[model samples]
Target chain A: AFIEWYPRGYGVAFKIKKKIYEKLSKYQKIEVYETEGFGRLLALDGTVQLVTLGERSYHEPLVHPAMLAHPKPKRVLVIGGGDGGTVREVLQHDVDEVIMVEIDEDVIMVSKDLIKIDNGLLEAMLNGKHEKAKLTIGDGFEFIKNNRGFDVIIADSTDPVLFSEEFYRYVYDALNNPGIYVTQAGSVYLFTDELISAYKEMKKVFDRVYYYSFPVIGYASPWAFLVGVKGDIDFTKIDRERAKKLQLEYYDPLMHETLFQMPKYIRETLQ
Target chain B: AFIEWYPRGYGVAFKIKKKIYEKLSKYQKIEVYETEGFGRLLALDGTVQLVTLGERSYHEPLVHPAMLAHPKPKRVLVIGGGDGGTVREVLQHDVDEVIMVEIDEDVIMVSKDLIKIDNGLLEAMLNGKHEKAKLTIGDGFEFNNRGFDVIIADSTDPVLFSEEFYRYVYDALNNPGIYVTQAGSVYLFTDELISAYKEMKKVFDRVYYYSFPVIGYASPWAFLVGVKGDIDFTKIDRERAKKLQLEYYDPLMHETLFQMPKYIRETLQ
Candidate 1:
């Protein structure tokens, strides 16, 4: 059997030969946290590490690319991810504050216990103002409905049907997304079949949505990111400086534009 | 049980609940196709296709990086790799010609059957000028007795064992090698600890070895190409001109050496 944290969940693909090789996380630097079923909540750097959360690379790529993609991101909000990777990344921008709402205390506890994420990730983003990192442990969907307008709103949740349907719906409402509203899309090969149908459904609520994977190691398992933009999410239209300032381990405007470059197989299927 | 393709052969990891996930090279793109275990034959492409030995990327990265690293690489030799990915990549370099010798028909047949590798990969590589790629089936260890300026040797007979032996096999051969005398070295994470031990003992034999992982999809694995003299293999010192009519993909010189740049810097200023 082999395991991949590739899709949105912690699924173990059972093999007939019975040889198990636990693949590494998307982030190559860190060793893959071993687990069973969904994934094991292991400790990395003395913190509650949810190895299945994909690598922290996703949080950094999705949050900052969209945040810095904006002209001037003053407000930021993260729905569903309470482990703090997304929070730490969102706070990287000169935002008024970053609000994080998570439904799972287990995730938070896992974070608090096994993977005590270093505060520095948030510090660099919040300009050392730890206060910029705000938390609300509750239903993410409810929190978004009552939220104020955000320059950029990042949906850092797992699969939509699992705990994020409402968050996905209401998320578009809370955002003043000037550039791209990015989310964890699916795989180019395996997930392409369902993702297109899902995006076609999403088309009802959002304006222009496109996708492609950000090639981060371990996670470069051909995972992609999808964004439903209100308008143009192209380079010439973006504030190039902030976009560049929003550098990440696995993303950049150069790459953001490329993500939309679906493989021929993907394009054929999407059609 | 779930299966994944681990770089070094295959294995199974059992969950605490005892759910086993197996990674069988019943499919693999490894240089020296190992069938001692169950490795599927890519009946179509005429080369093995697995998660690790990606048809285009691996062959391209391994072969091209070496060619482009040299100022002007002419006359090259590739040993082992019956999957034809290495030979496929070597053919693309501006080198005058390439001599690819393979020992396994099983891997070659699989590349043709399952992967169809030869059609686009090997065929295209060899498809160039008739003088470009010369395919000869034989043992690579003997060929190493004679040498060329540029050699991209990719073999998978485990190093620490009786599987095969080619020590200082680079001894007799000679080439002006614009870049340092270099040889292919794989860094399979599965055998990383053991590799560090046995490999360091080998690379330092005749030259300096630097480890690098070209950042391409499915190619995060690291490998060291040992360089003799000042043929600096580190990305920092080397300059990459995309215009250099070369082999494989982009050969750009990275600012910081370690290809992965795995280190997270202190942006705390």
Candidate 2:
């Protein structure tokens, strides 16, 4: 088999050893394949989604920064992360509850059945043993509109097109006064405009808005995250003593302030 | 035309608009091509060197942090940066002198010949007759024993040619001197990063490993920068870095690049 990837005019490809799974979900197409060196890959809509070898690099930075920032993210809402990788990281925080609302249940099914594929993210959380975490399958927009009082909310969706002002309005009015909202902003290389759009919309709702980036190999470019804070909370200034106890592999207190630091082009363009 | 690029296990290809130059120098095969969308590309021994669009992302980080860290870099030595991109960034500083030594002179010649390529990095230095910057075609290891202020190794990969020159690179520097080298990708080359760090630690008073990512490479990559000195080299002079009007390399990124992941730290260990 063959994989064709073109990221920001840079063309990349991989020879596939076997095709594990392929299906068109209600929301989008989900495909899984095994590559020679990069390990198992999960791709959606002809785009390389995540690889087993480097998923930690993407998921850890996505979940930990917001969790470490909140004093105690007791009630958390996760949107569009069907693979359960984000839930797995969220459960690590000892949160009171984790509600993962993915639009499609097919993606969740593949992750749970493909035991060797996920590092067992879905199975561990969906086995009915983990009482703190719950998987809810439905429209994410409806879920966010209905539920409120979340200490932290994370949108691990694919693109910025789905996360529009309607969602921002719910987050602004529904979230607790001192809540935190963060979403996966697109790559700084190709998706700078998306990051700029997210930042602009979030700034309208929240008191402070910021974007942080980290290296994720699965994507074509460096991944970025937009963080919006309400009340007087600051994600850059998190509780260091508590952060150390989280046993994090990526986010730490010393580097919190610097993670938000962007390159010259990003700083200029985002403004 | 067709262009084959194999960074590691992943075999990448570019739809070539034209093959601008092709020749073999004393050490390796130098080829230059223009690809659709990716712009002009340089390849040596089947390994990708730089794409026209993303060259600044790689060259700026490789050159600036070390240049800004040093208190005052008077006499400087660059090893294996035959492409002239590194020399271009080095000359940006108000240094007394810059001596660039590459194993192959052909790469420099081709870089100068390609007028529209390199963002005009080579043409600017070559045509203007910059008195302070000089180019030498020789073994970097032999020449290092002579000069002594700051050392920057822009060599292609860790194992491609110059690991031994790294041993001599530390001894060639003045006391309280600084050094930087770009190793292979962190995910692709673990043992190489460890060796470069260990070798530098043995020879220099201070040894540090920092990783930064760039596009048009294999996997999620990390480039290694090694700093050698007793004084604190982690933080650079912010006002000076800003005053340079560097298109890239902000003060925050200079510090943040050192903030590596725990898995990489474990891999290096």
- In model 2 chain B, the worst 10-residue window by lDDT is B1-10
Q: Native contacts recovered, in order, as a fraction for each? A: 0.00, 0.52
Each model's TM-score, in the order given?
Answer: 0.55, 0.91
Stretches of candidate 2 off by over 4 Å are A1-8, A115-130, A245-254, B1-8, B11-18, B115-128, B159-164, B219-230, B267-269
Error of 2 at B175 (Å): 2.8
* Residue-by-residue lDDT tens digits, candidate 1, B1-269: 22333443222211122211222234443232222122232321222233222244446545655566565667777765656667655655466777777665455554554545455555543445455777666666655345565666665423322213324433423443421212222222424433433553454333323222222213233344544334444332134344433322334422212222112211100
Q: Write the per-residue lDDT of candidate 2 for residues A82-132, one digit (tens) a residue.
A: 777787788778789888888888888877776244456566566756678
Off by over 4 Å in 1: A1-49, A52-54, A118-130, A137-148, A161-173, A177-179, A195-212, A215-220, A231-271, B1-78, B85-98, B103-133, B137-269
What lDDT tens digits, residue by residue, belong to model 1 across residues A103-222?
665555445444546344433432544667666767666777787677666676654442244545665666674534666765444466667776665666666665544433333334
The Cα error of candidate 1 at residue B85, in Å, is 4.4
Lowest-lDDT window of 10 residues in candidate 1 chain B? B260-269
- After the best TM-score superposition of candidate 2, give how far the Cα of residue A35 lies from its true spot, in angstroms: 1.5
